Write a protein that binds this ligand. Sequence first.
Ligand SMILES: Nc1ncnc2c1ncn2[C@@H]1O[C@H](COP(=O)(O)OP(=O)(O)O)[C@@H](O)[C@H]1O
Ligand SMILES: Nc1ncnc2c1ncn2[C@@H]1O[C@H](COP(=O)(O)OP(=O)(O)O)[C@@H](O)[C@H]1O
Ligand SMILES: [Mg+2]
Ligand SMILES: [Mg+2]
Lengths: 332, 322
Amino acid sequence: GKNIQVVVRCRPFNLAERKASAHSIVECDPVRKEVSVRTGGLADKSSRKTYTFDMVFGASTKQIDVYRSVVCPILDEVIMGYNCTIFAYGQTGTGKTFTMEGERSEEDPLDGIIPRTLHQIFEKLTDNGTEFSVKVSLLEIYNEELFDLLNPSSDVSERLQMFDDPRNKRGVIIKGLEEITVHNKDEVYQILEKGAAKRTTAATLMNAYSSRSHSVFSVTIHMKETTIDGEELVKIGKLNLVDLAGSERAREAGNINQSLLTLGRVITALVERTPHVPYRESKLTRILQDSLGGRTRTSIIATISPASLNLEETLSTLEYAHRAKNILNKPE
Amino acid sequence: GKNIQVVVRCRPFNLAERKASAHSIVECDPVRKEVSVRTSRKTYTFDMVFGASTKQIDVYRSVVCPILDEVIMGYNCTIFAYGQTGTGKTFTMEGERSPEEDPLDGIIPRTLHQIFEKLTDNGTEFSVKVSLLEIYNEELFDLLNPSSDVSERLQMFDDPRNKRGVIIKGLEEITVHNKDEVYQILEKGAAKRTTAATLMNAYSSRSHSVFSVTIHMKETTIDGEELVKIGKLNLVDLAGSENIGNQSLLTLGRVITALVERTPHVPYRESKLTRILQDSLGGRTRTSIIATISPASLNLEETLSTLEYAHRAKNILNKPEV
Ligand SMILES: Nc1ncnc2c1ncn2[C@@H]1O[C@H](COP(=O)(O)OP(=O)(O)O)[C@@H](O)[C@H]1O
Ligand SMILES: Nc1ncnc2c1ncn2[C@@H]1O[C@H](COP(=O)(O)OP(=O)(O)O)[C@@H](O)[C@H]1O
Ligand SMILES: [Mg+2]
Ligand SMILES: [Mg+2]
């Protein structure tokens, strides 16, 4: 019960889990906001471990219903001119990218957050008369090094440098980052497309895999609203959509442990109001600082597998989400 | 190495791999017997290397035939499939039935078809028995016993005729009276494996699966010799290599290195698996490990780990380049 929402989304079985003879160990109960996992080793059908969250989504949960519960309330905040962040956390293949982006293959029912938010920003702002402009940026953090995914020319190993700008505190300046003007609703798709192809090339040429790196898609809205006898009103607002690296050579994995672990140290600090927030201690936390501790709405989506095969990773991601906002199991 | 062969079989991409837009990170060179992984590039060399287009029949022709010729002479032999869950261990050991021999038949059914075809064709007098057990959490479960219940596990004892040998009390052995009986036999085991996973949580991906075929032979030739023999083939489908980090996989590996390098101690007694199998690993015998891997970037960490395992078990120096 705070500005920090921690929720869990369990995916359906994949084909590999079915080929492996995996069994369902995850039980999701949306009404009690609980998730339990049968933890039993040999001959133990007794032990189950429960966790309670702000929200629990089962495997049959639709995209649009994750959007309506988690994203709408954050968008309103943004439209009022605030900075907010939504994180997808979890094991590779549990649906981080699916939640954040989705796919096409009205509103395409497989759409994730990113295309859906754009469509609403446009629908809402154009309905209520607001004067506005929409900018998006997409970068990637691999090995504590930033890479612009949207820069049309300059396709290379080219890193971006980050400076702590004297101008504003809490903030940071990334020199050279492409910010693209979004001219209309459906334009997200080709922008996601361009970022994709580039992402692919950085996978093959630098072996930087999207499963090993943080993906930050930023949208900024400039709004001007006026009403007769209504006070002309000027607002900027910012929405950060972060698709994290997998939570599951030796050097760079040590690094991804450090960031997620720091991001978590940060979220725990925000929840507790316990001062001294260690934004400093990783690039990711640094890039996002202005949208985090400065009071705001913040959300974490934790993804999980239903299968016995994934039990260790599933428990870790729930141990993690739970260390982030500790909320107690309730009786009965 | 000699009678210890270590080969790799890489499987084709699967769908999750295509849809993730996974990059193929291994090159398998059959001719140079090499597997390379882009990581720069790490290259390993084996006794043989099977690309993703390798058919079951070719694996068998190449790996099994010589091992089986050896079993038919009256010797005990072992073949292991090692690798990550999903890479093809069961596809290699068993195969799949499709909806002349099913081109999708793995080692177990081809071995049984060959034993029958070969031994009746030379007019040898012979009897085939098979047994199937499962190792989970250092405990033995018979998959062929029609009776009892999920929770019953087998006890082994030292064997007074054989110091390298072991007796598993109550292990069910099934006579095979013809070629195809092996299909229904494999089906009984699967049904019981399902039960044990449901009731005991012994999950198949977490379990060593040991399929042993025993052959009794009397071969007679007028003007030649009267030959009495017992052959044994153990076909072992290991637990998923991602569980490494259990010790039984690590012990198996330490035991194979000792055999290849010949160090004074070979630690068979340090796992049920090596214990069970010590009699066919007793050296001067055919032993073969098939290491299975995926080609995709998704699976890299585990593919590297499998290759390291394979390389540590038998360490072959790389030849020179182009
Ligand atoms: N809730 C869900 N419903 C349907 N499909 C899903 C769900 N979550 C994940 N998937 C599917 O699982 C696969 C892997 O998901 P992906 O988002 O690529 O995972 P990650 O970002 O965690 O690596 C994709 O094929 C995606 O369609
Ligand atoms: N070499 C191969 N050629 C064709 N299909 C394969 C191969 N290896 C595995 N497969 C397929 O991949 C899937 C998983 O195989 P499986 O044998 O269950 O792996 P494992 O038992 O090691 O977990 C199955 O659909 C199987 O048919
Ligand atoms: Mg992803
Ligand atoms: Mg298997």
